[PDB]
Design a protein around this ligand. Structure first.
Ligand SMILES: Nc1ncnc2c1ncn2[C@@H]1O[C@H](COP(=O)(O)OP(=O)(O)O)[C@@H](O)[C@H]1O
Ligand SMILES: Nc1ncnc2c1ncn2[C@@H]1O[C@H](COP(=O)(O)OP(=O)(O)O)[C@@H](O)[C@H]1O
Ligand SMILES: [Mg+2]
Ligand SMILES: [Mg+2]
Ligand SMILES: [Mg+2]
Ligand SMILES: [Mg+2]
Lengths: 121, 237, 237, 121
């Protein structure tokens, strides 16, 4: 069982995403904003980060950037899962080390496929 | 107020952003069920349908807020006053924001300077909506690294009416925006650059509600440190 | 173009109206299932979940259209051209509007004046979107009592490019609106008074798409009788 | 089994509403706009009309008004089922002889309760 850091400000999304992830046997750690996320990263390293962009306190891009400037953090795979349409936003996230970008709303199955692909690399 | 047209167009995109949040949940759980028909028991299915119904209710509400906006701009919204205890009204509002404030580790506090059976002739639903809006903004715009993030409701009565203050140690508000934050669709540049969820409607709605009671709302804040929102509502006739 | 602000505020209400149509279906079927858990078989349940998923897709699209609007106003939309056969492109578009036109007993017709392998260097998705918009308006704005309601696509090539006409015996368009119907958020008063579903975005989007191909779109119509929309797209370089 | 005229321009709504109605044993006749509706009324009288407001060709208010100016039509019970929020719209519909006005989205059960109440009067 791998460990996943779920970062998003919507509880319903967290609860939903957690269900799909735990269905595949994974352990889930939830963070509701960018700062919460970074606090949890300082005292453990997850196998994957599912990351939202638009959040209070600290946004996803700030997180992405702060992940890069640390050695132990910049190798952790990140799926950006955002309600933002843009091709500029996808491109920026990728250039900040995000592996995949997925637009909300999304298919929970295709999400699961993409999670497994990154955990088996 | 020319530049108002530039605001309304940034709002269209913001409307899609917040509407597609509950939509994500709906299409999510619905696909979860449609696929896992065998695996799922008919009692977690109930739990799943519930949240779909509740989430489609949340986005019904987000649309309702858009109507109530254009119900104030078009100028037809009726205010149904009655005598309410503000102490328990704000307590209900503090209790409604519990889970949201918990998430981002924001402390919700209510303090009354005057003994608590404080009554006033006001719309119970509309004033609550004002409280919730301010309280929410309190949580929504809290500092990145401030040891203890708090939002404080101070209830007092003086100056020919009732005075409500919503305090927060949050990101503060610059001088040029101290007035403009009550305009329709207006969000401070920071909210845009740091990808904060929002519409720019909350306060515009709030202001119109307060002034329909013949009251006033302003803000005293400094950019680094703390923001205080003042809501004054007159009592006698 | 001052009065544009008065249009954007009537649009907010129109956005809620069309967004809450698929939402009605979603919350509907979801409540149907949540209640009739025993009565329902696990194969009509599939049929029911399908339509929830499809309807949440429809309102995802209605939001997408709002983005693509503000993607043109903000001026960043890329046009991906290629050589397409317009004959089968419009046939696909005529076939996409089949069920909608059937409902209101509107006849969809495609006619080509020039032999049919008509090719042009255009964005296949964006031009289709223009066709669909015009075709839809053809059905949407048909006469109350006209024996046979029709919409006609006439495809011809002349005048340094390709010329597409969308004809309808519909309610027609007054003189003062002949130009303004392509403005963002603009709907003719009739659409408002007779409670016709719409946003005022369709044609504004359409126009910008046509002109990004370096083409032009205008209308020739008379209020009583018939409306013809002209889409011209240049061919050579 | 009573007969119901379902007037609405959204097929998904019609298909949904038809299911709830037929579940209670009722016969359903569908109309997609105001004119279609009036054509079907000329060659049969239903026990109930479920009526939408915003439609192409002919709106619900026009229908409501044209129902009033005829003797055989003005006694047929009408539920207005509309995506329009207004209190002016509800009041207008009622003054044009509409019995109930229900806002979309709605509860299919409460709808069914209201349908039964008007069919047993
Ligand atoms: N407590 C606060 N601290 C800092 N900024 C605030 C606060 N409340 C409101 N603002 C600013 O005022 C703007 C208008 O507020 P509001 O009408 O609620 O819009 P929004 O939906 O963006 O919160 C916000 O976008 C934000 O920039
Ligand atoms: N075929 C037509 N016949 C009559 N009026 C039309 C036609 N097409 C468009 N219009 C008018 O032009 C307006 C703008 O069209 P459009 O951008 O598609 O907006 P809408 O979403 O209201 O259809 C419509 O509201 C309608 O009043
Ligand atoms: Mg978010
Ligand atoms: Mg707000
Ligand atoms: Mg249109
Ligand atoms: Mg309708």
């Amino acid at each position: 069982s791998k460990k996943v850091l779920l970062v998003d400000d919507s509880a319903p999304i967290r609860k939903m995403v957690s269900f799909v992830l735990k269905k595949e046997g994974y352990e889930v750690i939830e963070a509701e904003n960018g700062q919460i996320a970074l606090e949890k990263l300082s005292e453990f390293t997850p196998d994957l980060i599912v990351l939202d962009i638009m959040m209070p306190v600290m946004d996803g891009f700030t997180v992405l950037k702060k992940l890069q400037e640390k050695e132990e953090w910049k190798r952790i795979p990140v799926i950006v899962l955002t309600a933002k349409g843009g091709e500029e936003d996808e491109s920026l996230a990728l250039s900040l080390g995000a592996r995949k970008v997925m637009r909300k709303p999304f298919s929970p199955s295709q999400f699961i496929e993409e999670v497994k692909h990154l955990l088996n690399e | 107020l020319k530049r108002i047209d530039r605001m309304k167009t940034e709002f269209i995109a913001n409307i899609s952003h917040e509407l597609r949040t509950p939509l994500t949940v709906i299409k999510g759980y619905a696909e979860m069920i449609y696929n896992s028909l065998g695996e799922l028991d008919l009692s977690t299915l109930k739990e799943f349908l519930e949240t779909i119904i509740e989430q489609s209710n949340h986005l019904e509400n987000l649309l309702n807020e858009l109507l109530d906006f254009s119900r104030l701009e078009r100028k037809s919204l009726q205010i149904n006053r009655e005598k309410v205890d503000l102490c328990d009204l704000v307590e209900s509002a503090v209790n409604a924001i519990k889970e949201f404030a918990s998430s981002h580790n924001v402390n919700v506090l209510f303090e009354s300077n005057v003994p608590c059976p404080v009554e006033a002739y006001i719309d119970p639903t509309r004033i609550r909506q004002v409280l919730l809006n301010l309280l929410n903004n309190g949580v929504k715009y809290s500092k990145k690294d401030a040891p203890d993030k708090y939002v404080k409701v101070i209830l007092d009565e003086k100056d020919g009416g009732v005075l409500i203050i919503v305090e927060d140690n949050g990101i503060g508000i610059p001088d040029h925006a101290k007035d403009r934050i009550f305009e329709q669709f207006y969000r401070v540049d920071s909210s845009l650059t740091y990808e904060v969820p929002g519409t720019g409607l909350g306060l515009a709605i709030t202001k119109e509600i307060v002034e329909l009671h013949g009251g006033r709302i302003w803000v005293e804040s400094e950019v680094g440190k703390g923001s205080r929102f003042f809501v004054w509502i007159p009592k006698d006739r």
